[PDB]
């Protein structure tokens with residue numbers, strides 16, 4: 001029993017964190033096999049950030065301009081290349097602590113663990129979700145760039161995020177491990193803003209099923225809804241549309257609890273209308289949207 | 302910017318988790334130096350049950366390797382299995398007993414394999430609101446101080462309300478609980494006042510100031526009000542501990558207490574603080590300073 005926001009154990013990722021320095025800029029890098037991955041903006045000055053020509057800035061650098069530190073050991077950079085917004089530094093030592101890994105690009109609504117780092121040293125681990133507007137609500141200070149997001153389903157680490165910047169609203173923007181940004185963002189200090197955010201509907205439904213599994217049914221009702229009528233109501237509360245894919249994905253939880261997906265959709269419509277009336281669901285007075293259907297099945301009985 | 306419930310990096314603890322089997326029971330053990338620590342319920346008159354066991358009855362598995370048990374002893378509610386091999390991954394460590402209101406990270410494990418890490422607090426009623434299923438017994442709670450792991454909790458059981466009970470690493474239970482199947486219940490819980498105040502300071506640091514007011518209060522008047530809402534009493538020690546946060550934000554501790562008093566009597570009025578519609582009490586003053594300064598391990 002119990003339901004917590006739970007992160008994956010971070011040990012396999014801690015053994016990959018290194019410090020990357022280029023001139024006056026210091027940030028974090030991810031050391032896997034004989035390559036260190038880090039944000040390309042490590043080659044920029046604060047001035048270069050408005051309209052940087054990364055190709056022009058990189059061609060002026062040599063291997064010995066990049067200082068890479070793994071614990072108390074200095075690694076030797078023997079090559080460098082840029083792939084999208086990520087810099088790949090070839091080093092002369094393969095990481096003996098390299099776990100089994102994959103690079104995965106995730107979709108909005110997916111969750112992952114973040115190992116927040118400063119100066120190549122891990123400081124904390126937290127769980128978060130890729131928002132529908134492609135930002136993440138992280139907890140990051142200056143020097144956290146290069147910190148990574150990951151999932152460890154089974155024994156393999158799937159790297160899905162690398163931190164690059166903080167937008168003016170305090171939310172964060174980054175890339176996959178191939179350097180492609182999530183969202184319409186660029187690694188430039190030009191005027192950029194997160195779009196209006198919405199609630200991840202399929203995740204709220206998954207979390208209502210987690211509450212039923214743990215014993216709570218106060219929010220259920222005798223009603224059902226069509227998918228179209230639910231979406232017409234949901235859109236008015238800034239909730240993401242629920243697709244047939246989402247309904248199919250909630251199938252196993254529906255079968256376990258005996259509550260059809262459209263019946264749970266009717267319960268969500270009522271909660272949006274009534275609020276909680278002084279009650280809580282799994283210790284929360286708000287509807288939680290940072291647990292996926294897969295997270296609920298993994299954590300719950 | 303941002304404020305998350307954050308756990309310590311778990312790597313130093315993952316390298317200590319092993320599986321302990323005795324008969325039909327399988328649970329988790331903590332392998333430090335040449336000793337494996339686990340709940341004594343893996344084997345009631347525990348001395349009479351233990352005397353009937355031999356070293357070979359305890360099967361200890363570290364990854365895919367079987368460890369050899371060469372001795373066994375009991376210390377309070379913890380079983381200590383002496384093994385032939387010292388853990389090469391043993392970090393610098395201490396065993397510490399924590400107080401209610403203090404927070405720690407839990408590395409939830411099943412079959413000696415870590416599955417998740419979460420942050421939690423020792424409630425004033427000595428239970429923890431964890432997330433545990435069958436097989437989780439032996440999972441540990443910890444904090445990190447520079448490079449030293451301070452082990453403070455070992456999981457033993459789940460109470461009928463879904464909350465959890467356990468011991469320090471010396472086998473002494475937190476709370477009036479016993480390791481046996483008998484009627485036990487968590488006592489009435491209270492809110493950790495000093496932690497709610499620390500969390501209000503974190504919200505201010507992050508630009509959430511709607512709840513601030515021009516008012517102040519005496520410590521006595523605040524405690525009279527706090528006692529009415531099932532909040533723990535705030536002591537002068539707590540006020541002193543919130544000193545640095547008070548100096549950084551410019552809001553005196555008793556000034557923040559007047560905000561807390563208005564929040565208890567009037568509510569949030571449809572608003573949120575750090576994305577929460579409830580007053581959060583599982584961040585200590587030290588947690589707030591650490592997360593709003595980026596201390597590394």
Ligand SMILES: CNC(=O)[C@H](C)N1Cc2ccc(Cl)cc2[C@H](C(=O)Nc2cncc3ccccc23)C1
Pocket residue numbers: 041049140141142143144145164165166167172186187188189302
């Ligand atoms: C808020 N940002 C800033 O004040 C400065 C000037 N930033 C500009 C900028 C523009 C583009 C890119 Cl790709 C990176 C960056 C940097 C950036 O975003 N770094 C940070 C990341 N995460 C969290 C932070 C928290 C505080 C301060 C920097 C944080 C610097």
Ligand SMILES: CNC(=O)[C@H](C)N1Cc2ccc(Cl)cc2[C@H](C(=O)Nc2cncc3ccccc23)C1
Pocket residue numbers: 001342433434435436437438457458459460479480481482483
């Ligand atoms: C809820 N408990 C049970 O069903 C059984 C009969 N328990 C009795 C008992 C009595 C004393 C001690 Cl010290 C331990 C234990 C066991 C216990 O509590 N283990 C569990 C721990 N955490 C989480 C759990 C979740 C589910 C089921 C067991 C969980 C088993």
Ligand SMILES: [Cl-]
Pocket residue numbers: 105106107110
């Ligand atoms: Cl995905």
